[PDB]
Write a protein that binds this ligand. Sequence first.
Ligand SMILES: [NH3+]CCc1ccccc1
Ligand SMILES: [NH3+]CCc1ccccc1
Ligand SMILES: [Cu+2]
Ligand SMILES: [Cu+2]
Ligand code: NA
Ligand code: NA
Lengths: 620, 620
Amino acid sequence: ASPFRLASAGEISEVQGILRTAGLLGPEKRIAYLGVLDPARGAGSEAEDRRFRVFIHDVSGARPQEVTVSVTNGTVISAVELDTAATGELPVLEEEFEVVEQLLATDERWLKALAARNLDVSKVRVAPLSAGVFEYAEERGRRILRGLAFVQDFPEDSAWAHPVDGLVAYVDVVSKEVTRVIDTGVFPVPAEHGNYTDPELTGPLRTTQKPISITQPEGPSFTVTGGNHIEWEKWSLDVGFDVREGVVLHNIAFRDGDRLRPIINRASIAEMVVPYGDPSPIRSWQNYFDTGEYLVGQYANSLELGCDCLGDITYLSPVISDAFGNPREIRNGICMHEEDWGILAKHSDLWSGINYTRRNRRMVISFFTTIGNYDYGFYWYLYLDGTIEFEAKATGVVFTSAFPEGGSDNISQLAPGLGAPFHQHIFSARLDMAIDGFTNRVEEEDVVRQTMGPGNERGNAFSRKRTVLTRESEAVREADARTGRTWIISNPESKNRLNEPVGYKLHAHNQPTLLADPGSSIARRAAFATKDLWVTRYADDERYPTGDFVNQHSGGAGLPSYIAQDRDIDGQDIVVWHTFGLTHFPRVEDWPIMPVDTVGFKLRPEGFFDRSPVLDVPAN
Amino acid sequence: ASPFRLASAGEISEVQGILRTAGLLGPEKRIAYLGVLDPARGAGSEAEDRRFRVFIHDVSGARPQEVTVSVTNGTVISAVELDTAATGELPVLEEEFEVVEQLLATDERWLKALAARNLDVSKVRVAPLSAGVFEYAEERGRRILRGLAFVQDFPEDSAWAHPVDGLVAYVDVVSKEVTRVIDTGVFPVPAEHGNYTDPELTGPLRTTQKPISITQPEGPSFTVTGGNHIEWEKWSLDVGFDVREGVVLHNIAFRDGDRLRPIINRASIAEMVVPYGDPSPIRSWQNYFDTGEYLVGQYANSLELGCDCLGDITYLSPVISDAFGNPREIRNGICMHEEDWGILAKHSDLWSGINYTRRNRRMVISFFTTIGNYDYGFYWYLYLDGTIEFEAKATGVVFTSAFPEGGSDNISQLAPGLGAPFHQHIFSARLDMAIDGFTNRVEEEDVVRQTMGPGNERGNAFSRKRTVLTRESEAVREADARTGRTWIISNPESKNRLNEPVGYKLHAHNQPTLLADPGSSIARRAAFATKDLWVTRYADDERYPTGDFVNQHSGGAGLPSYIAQDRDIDGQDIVVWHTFGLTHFPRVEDWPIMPVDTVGFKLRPEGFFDRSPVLDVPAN
Ligand SMILES: [NH3+]CCc1ccccc1
Ligand SMILES: [NH3+]CCc1ccccc1
Ligand SMILES: [Cu+2]
Ligand SMILES: [Cu+2]
Ligand code: NA
Ligand code: NA
C-alpha cells in the first residue's frame, strides 16, 4: 500500500519491458543506475505514481541517457541524452572492473614494465580506480579508469600485500585503448604475504572465548508491516534501499502520547569520498567517491546470522537491477534488531528513600558494503530517549604501496618494504529535516565565556548564544570544539509547554574536514567536504552534495551551486548536510586486515518533549 | 599473596586496633579517609608491607591528623597534626550531612526566612554543600558547609522539584554555629511535583518491551584469582578499590605471544569537579569536588542483577572503613562481565574469493555512585584489539533553582517556575603510564596541511608532525580538534619489528574545559581543569591533581605546584593527567530524572604490536 515500499522484482521487470519496447535497452545498452523516486511534496492526493530513474550507458560509444519511467502508467516520462564532457560520466559499471586488467594484459608498454620486474602477467591484478579530472585534455568527454597493479602469488593470495609501485596506466574503457603507461622507476615488490587465514600467520587460534548467547524468548519488540514499515518503542519509520545511497530512512516519527510527531523526513549518507595524501605521481590523482562513482548499495554483503548480526535478527532482502534490467535480490542485505544499551536512568535518593533504575535499549538498522579493498558498515540507531545516531564502521584492507627506502612524510610503513599512504574517509549525511512538520530553522549554539566583573563578581558565570541561519549564503558552517559548538534544528511554530520552540540538537564529532589544498581538483569536486555543516532549502532535484554525475565531473556541482541561490531557510522546508570523517594515518595494527574504526554523529531532543519521554519504561 | 589485593575486613580491624591502642581513636575522633597505599617503586624485594593511610577528624575542635599505619608490622609509622588553615580541611563526613539541617532548624534567622514563605520547618530539607574559599575571612581555618533548602511535601516526595531560592545559610559544623543567613528575596516555591514513580506522572507503563536474554552457557571467558586479579583475552590486571577514587586499575598488561607486556601501571579517575555558572549570590560559590571533597567510593551503590548489570556478572564486594574504624562491605559494589561488541574485522575479497568476518567483544568493569542529587557510573572497557576506554555515565536529578520571571542567561527552565543552572562535570584521569616498561615519553601529534607547489603539484598531500614533550614546564597541553591533535605515549627503548618505538595513542573527545574566569576561586582550586593534558614525572606523593586536602583549600595545590619542578620527562617514569568533561545546559528532557549522558576517552595501540593482535580470534 505504502508509496515508500521497497521496489519489487515485478516493478523492476516492468521497467525493463518499458525501456526495451521504447528502444532504449538495445544490446549495446547497460543500466548504470536504477532507483525509485520519492513521492513529491504534497502526497496528500493518494494518487500513487511509482516512478523510477534510470541511467543508461552505451558500450558502443553513443551518448548515455537519463530516463524517468512510470511503472504505474507503463510510460517513459522523459528521456534526455547526456553530454558527459559537460555534466559528468555515468557511475562505474561492475563489468568494467576486469576490463582494465584485460586491456593492459596485451599492451606492449604494460608488458614491458612487468617484464623488467620479472612479473608473470597472469599473476598481476589491476585495481580499477576512478580517474578524476586533472591535466590530461585528451580525457575530457571520455570514459577513463586508471590502473594500479598488485601481485597474486596464487589464487587465494591477498594481492594487497604485493603492490607494484612506480607504475600506473590510464585506460579508455569504451574505445578499449590504453592511453598512457607511466613508469617512474622500479620498486621492490614487498615479499611478505598478508594472508590472515594462514595458520603460519595467525598461529594457533584462541580457545579461551566462551560463547555469548543473545536471545529474545518472546520475539522482538518491533513490528514490520508492509515489507519495510517499522514500529518500535514509539518510533515509526520506513526503511528504504537505493543502489547508490544504500539504506535510506523515511518518515522518522515519534508517537508522543496520542500524536504522531515527525522528526526527519529523509535520512541518508548521500556521498562519501576517500582522498589520498601521497604526492607521488603514481597516486596523487587518487580519490574515489564510493557512493557517487561506484554505488555502495549494489555491493552490499549478504549478512550471516551469528557472524555479522547476532541476536534475534529480522532481515530485509532489497531488490536492485543488474546491468541488463533483470531484478536481483540481495539476500539478507539489511539486518535489524534491538540491543540492550545499559542504564537509561538511575537515582537513589537520600531523602525520599526511593531507589530507581531503568535500562536503555536501541533499535539497530545496518548493512555492510565492499568496494575493492575497503569494507564499510552503516549503522542507524534509535534510542528509547529520542536520540538518533549514525555510525560508520571502517574495516577491510588498507590500500598499499611500496615503502620508500629513506622513508616518507605521507606514507606509513606496515611491513618490510610495504607502505600505506595517508588518506581520509569523509561522509556526507543528508538530513531532510521535519521537526514537528516542515517549518524548520537552524541555529548555531556556542558556549559564551564571561569576564569577572559587575554582575559576575566571582567569575563563575558562563552562558550560551544562538545564531539563526536565515539565508543559504550564511548557512555554511565550521565546527568549533573549543566553544562546544552544536546546531539546533527547531520549529518556530511548534512550542513545548514552556512556550519554547521544539528542537533537536546535532552533536558532531568535530574531526578534521578535507585536508587538501583549497586549489586542488579534489577540493573543487568534493567541496561539501571542506565544511562541517550546510543548510539548503528543499528542492526535488537537489539530491547529492556532489551532483548527479560525480565520475569525471570537473567540480562545482552540488552544494556550492545550490547555496548560490541564497534562498530563505528561516522557518522553511530545509535540508541539513553534515560532513564528518576519519583521517587515517595507518598503523602497523591495521595490517594485514584492519580492526574496525568508527565515526558518526547523533541528534538529541532539545525541548522537543514536555518532560523526559522515558518515564513510562517499566522496571526489567 | 598479591600486594595489590583488596583490603580485607581483618586488615581494617587491625588498623582500628592499632589506632585505638596508640591513643589516636578516642570518642571525639572520626576516620574521614582510610585507604591502602600502593607498593613503592621497586617491589622486587617481595618484602610485603601492607600500609594504610588514615585521615582522622576531631569533632571537639582539636587539630586533625594524618596517620600512616603498617598492618604488616602492627605499628604507627607516622602521625602528623594538620594546620587546616594552611593545607586544607578533611573530606566531608557522611554524618555531617544531616547536621546542617538540624542546626538551621533552631536558628532564629532561618526560621524567620521559612515563616515568611509559609514553609513548615519539618518539611524543609537542606543540602549539605561544600563551601569553597571566597571572601569570608571568618571561615579561614574553620569547617564550613553551606546550605540550600528544598521542600518535601511528604516523605516520598522528590524535594528537588521544590527549591527554595533567594535563601542560603553558612554553618560551622564543629562549633555548631550558623555564621550567616542570607535572604535576597522571596521566590515562589515551584509547585509541580517531580515524582517519577507516580502513575499520574508516568501514565500507564509500556507493555511493548520484550525481554532480551544475555547468557553465557559455559560461563565467562575471564578468570578471577586472588580475589581481584583478572585474566581475559590476553589482558591481565588487578582491580583495586579506594574510598576516595573508587575503582582503580593496577598493572594493566597484555600477553603478546610468550611475553607479558606492561601498558599502564595505575589508572584512576583522580578528581572530578562540578562548577556552576549561575552568578546569583545564592549559588555563585557552588562547586563540589565529588571525588576530593566527598569521596565517591564510599557512596558506591549495591548493583542488582538484571537491573544494573545484565548478563553473566561476576561481583566484587570491596571493604571500606566507617567513621569509627569498623569494616563495612559494599555488597556487589563492582560488576564485571564481557559484552559482545559487533564486528571486529571484515573483508570479502574480489580476487582471492575469501570471505572473512570476526566479532569483537569487550571486558567491562564498572561501579555506580550517588552523591546527593547526582548519580555517576564509571566504566572501564578492555577490547580484543588492545584498545582501552573509559566512559562516565551521568544521570540522577539535576540541581534546581527557581526560574526567574523575565528569564535568565545562566539557567534553563524545566517546568513552570523551576530552573536548572548551567554547570559542567569535569573529570581528571590519572594514567601512571608503563608502555613496555617505565621509560616513556609523550609526543603531541598534529595533522599538517601542505600547500600546492613544488613536490605537491596536485595539492593533495597532507602529513603529520610529532613534538616530544621533554620537561614538565612544556607538558601542559590544550586540545585542537581542527588539527586532529592526539598524544602518543611511547617507549623510545622498545621497538617493534620495523624498528619504531612502541606506543599508544590517546584519543580525547575535545569537549570544552573549565569555563570560569581564570581569575576565579574555582580556576585556582581546579587548575587541572583549565587544560586538557598534563604530564608529570612520577613521584610517590603526587596522587591527586588538586592535592590531598581539597575541602576549603585556597588553591594552587596539586598539578600547578608539581610541574613547577620542571623535571625531565623524556624517556622516564611519567604520569599523564587527562581532563575531560561535559558542559551541561539542562533541557526539559532532563526533568524529572535525567537520561544518561556520557563522556570519556580511549587509548589505542600505535605500533605497539608487530601486526594486528586479533589474527588468532576464531570464527564464531
Ligand atoms: N573504493 C573504490 C576503489 C577501488 C575499486 C576496486 C578495487 C580497489 C579499489
Ligand atoms: N555532589 C555533592 C553535593 C551534594 C551533596 C549532598 C546533597 C546534594 C548535593
Ligand atoms: Cu583508511
Ligand atoms: Cu549536569
Ligand atoms: Na525538510
Ligand atoms: Na609511569
